[PDB]
């Protein structure tokens, strides 16, 4: 998926927020890896993406 930078912290176990509560929630016993990379050159438009 795609989020904003400030919401990157929300994608992690034991997190609360708009993204965590309403969009994507991870379990407390989650086992895996989260990889977030900037996509400004891809998901940004002059008129607003």
């Amino acid at each position: 998926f795609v989020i904003r930078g400030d919401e990157v912290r929300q994608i992690a176990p034991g997190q609360t927020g708009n993204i965590a509560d309403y969009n994507y929630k991870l379990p407390d016993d989650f086992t895996g890896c989260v990889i977030a990379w900037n996509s400004n050159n891809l998901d940004s438009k002059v008129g607003g993406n």
Partner: protein
């Protein structure tokens, strides 16, 4: 004279009291009441205490 019996009683009773009093100890938790912790903290935070 009856102390041998009375003593016994007290011992047992004492233990129970101690046991019950152990329900009112923090043990390092923020509070000694489970309901208070549940109501004041989210599960991810509450479970720690």
């Amino acid at each position: 004279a009856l102390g041998k019996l009375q003593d016994v009683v007290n011992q047992n009773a004492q233990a129970l009291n101690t046991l019950v009093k152990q329900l009112s100890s923090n043990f390092g938790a923020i509070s000694s009441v489970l309901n208070d912790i549940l109501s004041r903290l989210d599960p991810p935070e509450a479970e720690v205490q």
